[PDB]
Enzyme design. Sequence first.
Site, mmCIF file in Angstrom:
data_model
loop_
_atom_site.group_PDB
_atom_site.id
_atom_site.type_symbol
_atom_site.label_atom_id
_atom_site.label_comp_id
_atom_site.label_asym_id
_atom_site.label_seq_id
_atom_site.Cartn_x
_atom_site.Cartn_y
_atom_site.Cartn_z
ATOM 1 N N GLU A 1 -9.604 -5.488 -4.274
ATOM 2 C CA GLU A 1 -8.884 -4.444 -3.557
ATOM 3 C C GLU A 1 -9.742 -3.208 -3.363
ATOM 4 O O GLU A 1 -9.567 -2.493 -2.372
ATOM 5 C CB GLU A 1 -7.592 -4.095 -4.278
ATOM 6 C CG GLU A 1 -6.513 -5.091 -3.935
ATOM 7 C CD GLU A 1 -5.130 -4.587 -4.213
ATOM 8 O OE1 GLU A 1 -4.209 -4.973 -3.472
ATOM 9 O OE2 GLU A 1 -4.973 -3.782 -5.148
ATOM 10 N N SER B 1 0.857 -1.212 0.000
ATOM 11 C CA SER B 1 0.000 0.000 0.000
ATOM 12 C C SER B 1 0.879 1.243 0.000
ATOM 13 O O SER B 1 1.744 1.398 -0.873
ATOM 14 C CB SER B 1 -0.966 -0.050 1.143
ATOM 15 O OG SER B 1 -1.562 1.181 1.266
ATOM 16 N N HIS C 1 -8.087 -5.797 -0.083
ATOM 17 C CA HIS C 1 -6.871 -5.021 0.111
ATOM 18 C C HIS C 1 -6.305 -5.266 1.512
ATOM 19 O O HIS C 1 -7.052 -5.355 2.493
ATOM 20 C CB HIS C 1 -7.224 -3.543 -0.116
ATOM 21 C CG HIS C 1 -6.072 -2.589 0.006
ATOM 22 N ND1 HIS C 1 -5.071 -2.498 -0.942
ATOM 23 C CD2 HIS C 1 -5.818 -1.610 0.908
ATOM 24 C CE1 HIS C 1 -4.220 -1.548 -0.591
ATOM 25 N NE2 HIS C 1 -4.657 -0.988 0.517
HETATM 26 C C1 LIG Z 1 -10.670 11.284 10.239
HETATM 27 O O1 LIG Z 1 -9.588 10.679 10.999
HETATM 28 C C2 LIG Z 1 -8.830 9.891 10.175
HETATM 29 C C3 LIG Z 1 -8.932 8.504 10.309
HETATM 30 C C4 LIG Z 1 -8.173 7.670 9.500
HETATM 31 C C5 LIG Z 1 -8.305 6.272 9.586
HETATM 32 N N1 LIG Z 1 -8.346 5.925 8.137
HETATM 33 C C6 LIG Z 1 -9.184 5.087 7.456
HETATM 34 O O2 LIG Z 1 -10.070 4.360 7.939
HETATM 35 C C7 LIG Z 1 -8.931 5.065 5.926
HETATM 36 C C8 LIG Z 1 -9.164 3.603 5.416
HETATM 37 C C9 LIG Z 1 -8.216 2.649 5.367
HETATM 38 N N2 LIG Z 1 -8.753 1.484 4.873
HETATM 39 C C10 LIG Z 1 -8.281 0.019 4.490
HETATM 40 C C11 LIG Z 1 -9.242 -1.114 4.924
HETATM 41 C C12 LIG Z 1 -8.665 -1.927 6.122
HETATM 42 C C13 LIG Z 1 -7.257 -2.602 5.797
HETATM 43 C C14 LIG Z 1 -6.173 -1.620 6.032
HETATM 44 C C15 LIG Z 1 -6.470 -0.482 6.961
HETATM 45 C C16 LIG Z 1 -5.457 0.566 6.940
HETATM 46 C C17 LIG Z 1 -5.569 2.119 6.671
HETATM 47 C C18 LIG Z 1 -5.276 2.212 5.212
HETATM 48 N N3 LIG Z 1 -5.501 3.332 4.334
HETATM 49 C C19 LIG Z 1 -5.185 3.271 2.979
HETATM 50 C C20 LIG Z 1 -5.348 4.324 2.056
HETATM 51 C C21 LIG Z 1 -4.955 4.003 0.739
HETATM 52 CL CL1 LIG Z 1 -5.041 4.984 -0.648
HETATM 53 C C22 LIG Z 1 -4.441 2.780 0.364
HETATM 54 C C23 LIG Z 1 -4.316 1.780 1.269
HETATM 55 C C24 LIG Z 1 -4.654 2.052 2.540
HETATM 56 C C25 LIG Z 1 -4.467 0.981 3.365
HETATM 57 N N4 LIG Z 1 -3.939 -0.142 2.862
HETATM 58 C C26 LIG Z 1 -4.730 1.000 4.683
HETATM 59 C C27 LIG Z 1 -4.518 -0.137 5.522
HETATM 60 C C28 LIG Z 1 -4.862 -1.629 5.257
HETATM 61 C C29 LIG Z 1 -4.055 0.128 6.944
HETATM 62 N N5 LIG Z 1 -10.206 1.867 4.587
HETATM 63 N N6 LIG Z 1 -10.320 3.192 4.940
HETATM 64 C C30 LIG Z 1 -7.334 8.255 8.520
HETATM 65 C C31 LIG Z 1 -7.219 9.647 8.386
HETATM 66 C C32 LIG Z 1 -7.979 10.501 9.209
HETATM 67 O O3 LIG Z 1 -7.916 11.902 9.109
#
Ligand SMILES: COc1cc(CNC(=O)Cc2cn(CCCC[C@@H]3C[C@@H]4Cc5nc6cc(Cl)ccc6c(N)c5[C@H](C3)C4)nn2)ccc1O
Lengths: 527, 527
Positions: free
Chosen positions: A323, A196, A436
Amino acid sequence: DIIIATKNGKVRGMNLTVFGGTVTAFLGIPYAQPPLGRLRFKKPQSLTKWSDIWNATKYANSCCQNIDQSFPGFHGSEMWNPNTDLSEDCLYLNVWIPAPKPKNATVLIWIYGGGFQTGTSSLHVYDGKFLARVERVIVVSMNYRVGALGFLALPGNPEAPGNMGLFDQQLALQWVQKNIAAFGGNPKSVTLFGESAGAASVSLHLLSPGSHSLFTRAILQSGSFNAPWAVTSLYEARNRTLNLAKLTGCSRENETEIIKCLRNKDPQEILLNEAFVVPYGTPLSVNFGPTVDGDFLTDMPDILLELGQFKKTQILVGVNKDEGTAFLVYGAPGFSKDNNSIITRKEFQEGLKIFFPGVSEFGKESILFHYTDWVDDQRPENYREALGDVVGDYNFICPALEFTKKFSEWGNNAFFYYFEHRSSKLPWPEWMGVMHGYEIEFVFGLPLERRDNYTKAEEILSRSIVKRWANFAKYGNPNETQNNSTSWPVFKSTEQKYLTLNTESTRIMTKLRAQQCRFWTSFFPKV
Amino acid sequence: DIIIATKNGKVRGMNLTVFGGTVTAFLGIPYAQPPLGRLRFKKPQSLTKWSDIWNATKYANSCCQNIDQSFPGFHGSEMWNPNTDLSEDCLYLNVWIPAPKPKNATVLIWIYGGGFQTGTSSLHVYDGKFLARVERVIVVSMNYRVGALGFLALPGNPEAPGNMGLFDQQLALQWVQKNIAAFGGNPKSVTLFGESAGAASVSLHLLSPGSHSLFTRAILQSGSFNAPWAVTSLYEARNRTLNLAKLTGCSRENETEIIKCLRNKDPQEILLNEAFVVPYGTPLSVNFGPTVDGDFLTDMPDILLELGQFKKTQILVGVNKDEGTAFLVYGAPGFSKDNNSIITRKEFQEGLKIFFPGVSEFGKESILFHYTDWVDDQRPENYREALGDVVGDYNFICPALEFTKKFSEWGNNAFFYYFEHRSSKLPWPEWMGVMHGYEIEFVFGLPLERRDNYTKAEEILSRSIVKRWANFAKYGNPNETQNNSTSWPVFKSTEQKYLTLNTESTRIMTKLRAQQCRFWTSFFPKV
Ligand SMILES: COc1cc(CNC(=O)Cc2cn(CCCC[C@@H]3C[C@@H]4Cc5nc6cc(Cl)ccc6c(N)c5[C@H](C3)C4)nn2)ccc1O
Ligand SMILES: COc1cc(CNC(=O)Cc2cn(CCCC[C@@H]3C[C@@H]4Cc5nc6cc(Cl)ccc6c(N)c5[C@H](C3)C4)nn2)ccc1O
């Protein structure tokens, strides 16, 4: 008692029982001065000795980052949230050494993914011990800064140049170059591997002149710098730094004091306005990532690989099948972790605007068109699967293909994989498929462990992948040469052969989603 | 001496040697008062007797029309130019009768194609004698007015209502209803068949209430009213009548004297300003065709067949393969009858603007996109073939499919063909392939004639098609039931089965160019 002298002091480790063998781990060695006070937003500063023994006996602090509570108490999402205290004091790394200590072992370095906004080397799925035990390698992993304290950019300003995260990664690489021999490692058999944003990080290491001499080979799982989410251009970079300034009450006239204002803001009012620095977002929004800084990356990465100014070496890159599915439970209407999520076309059209907010209205209708081509209008599932494929192919698959495609056209050995087993233990609904991120536990060899509820077929799938990944590290061919298993072709332009990965048979195929990818690669770039 | 009493006099015929048999032909019987003087632009007026014998012993005059001299002395184009004197006195028809005179024979009526701007029942490829000889049918063919003296429209004005051509066709149908019994014909086994604009004419007969009781079944070759070139909306209809007025010095204030001015203009200064009544044209420009007049067609034909207000009966409709190719030697840059015509992409892009002059600029890039998808960029021919397919699929193929598709969804038996033999005698270059219009000589059975340079395989292809076409006329199934040849499925929505036609084997297939057609049918309608 096992204790070994680095260039800056001596560090004590721990002895781990792994599969009726033992492995030495040194968790939380510091490699860069704590990036605090005067030092936040700057590039990591190298260490001065201690003399003194650093007890590398616990995982250090994860770097400051937001945490995903969309689903509190749900294993499927909290398994990625950090499991350590958060602290801007976090520039630590971990090495796992086989026992008896090897003498000239290959070193594998793990860079974790997280859309550059999250993540830490401390997760249970990144536990390098099984790799050291099973295939007698040295696994290393580091924490690098993340979110705005990793990637905030005002370009040309060393107070906040951009890319301090990748710079953290690379000083970790530097430390391995100078110290790993002490541990029985070979600083001339070093292969990076990430997933990622980590995958995108290691691809950026291939282009960075500063990192050319600190590794040999590269593994790319589910990420590459040319993905739409991976590199932020200098206009938005500034538009979101100067933004972050307005919501923290730091908006000034002189760049050299916006920055001093921002370092007297306590770490957390930085992290929760990070989400707003952009008007419209997506579930994939990388608010502060890599930029072109003229230091780590000397200009636009798509140009230098198209012109072929990169490290010449073998690479290993692949993707998973569904993914796109993980991200649609974080925005798209009609989607839930708790039902089959059968969307109607109208919901599909509003799904597209969240994931392509603008982007012109027509651009969407042609995306819709190219995928709506039902085989045939029967099946209720097909809008649902269509919206996963658009997000997956746009964001991950087609870039990987189009990445490796052109990395090979300059003479280097490339091998492409397609990983189609869904874990028997996956806590996400079946409709999400081969998600993914859920390649990684197999790569690290968690199912080799037999007390853990994986199926017997998954233990043999994992042992296999661990060996290929292994062998690609030492010898540069993803061979598992003795139990009559599939040979792995080289991915070249024209033929474009890829090996698939699952429990049943491992096939050789060509043309990984060629129709789709060439919509995204040839024409969508115009809209 | 064979001579037979019609409702308006008696007519003398001729005895023809056909294949060691004889056939009676009566060429040039009048069915409508000469549409001259007071009577041009009006609907055809029925006859008053003669008493007197009309010697129907020569092909009558072709209706006034332009003539194609793009290529003077080239058989391939002049074989479609008329072979009779031109005259606005032209409302004549021809019947061919088997000998011995049959007693209750099926009647086949031919309506010739010509983009409604050209054509005549007198051509050697429309020689009905072989059909009467071989399959003991009565073949009838009529001349109907054409160009502006067939289709000039000021709507609501009986002085020039529009559609006087189809009205000519239908009074011919009326004459068959009342007279064909005299000839040994059965006015209750009557099936129309046309090609191109003729095909589009017979499809319009299916929707016209005035024509419901004058025939039973329908054959559609390479044309249908829903094709983009076939029906002119009332705005352009008027914009080109009032136009024609300006270049003939007729522009007045009162519609009821524009028209009187236009009938004192001699027939030919009408015909050569016909080409300019439109700013931009294409090689396919139908300057004056069918319109919605509230008489023959009581409103927009796409609506009434979508609502299903049409004659309920079996239909037979098909297309040829390289139907687009004929028209690109009449505009498209890089194309010539005298070389292989290997175009470059830029020429392909300018080719598209001639055939889609406007139509927005993007509309073209998405047409380009959907077809440029090389399999693969190798082959120099592929731009050339691509531009033939766009013109053919847009203008003929996809409409036919989408025509018959929805004609069946109301319970009627439809059979679809795809005719893939290119004549051994075709005078056009090989690169043109199986051209528009070159199905017809096989249907009329010219290769059954053995003194004529067709190959033996083409004689058996022709005998076959003649029998199917025959049997579809009497019994409504395109069966040739005795020499173990392919059965012809019914075309329904869903399965969408079509029979192919060639020298080698005749296959059953589905999905006639489904990918292409559904670009043109589902999405292009928006641009
Ligand atoms: C609002 O507060 C926040 C909160 C967060 C927390 N982020 C998220 O939930 C974003 C997310 C991340 N994922 C992946 C599904 C679960 C498996 C993994 C979870 C992980 C966070 C993440 N973000 C990625 C963004 C991109 Cl473009 C590509 C891959 C990502 C990714 N592999 C993962 C992982 C795997 C770690 N779905 N949504 C981020 C930023 C913030 O500002
Ligand atoms: C400028 O003077 C004119 C001159 C003409 C002469 N017209 C043409 O050459 C137009 C044309 C016709 N064709 C068909 C290739 C040769 C086989 C046939 C020739 C015939 C004329 C014709 N026009 C058609 C227009 C449409 Cl949309 C569809 C089918 C047509 C068609 N089948 C034919 C045929 C077959 C009779 N290519 N271009 C027409 C109108 C004018 O104003």
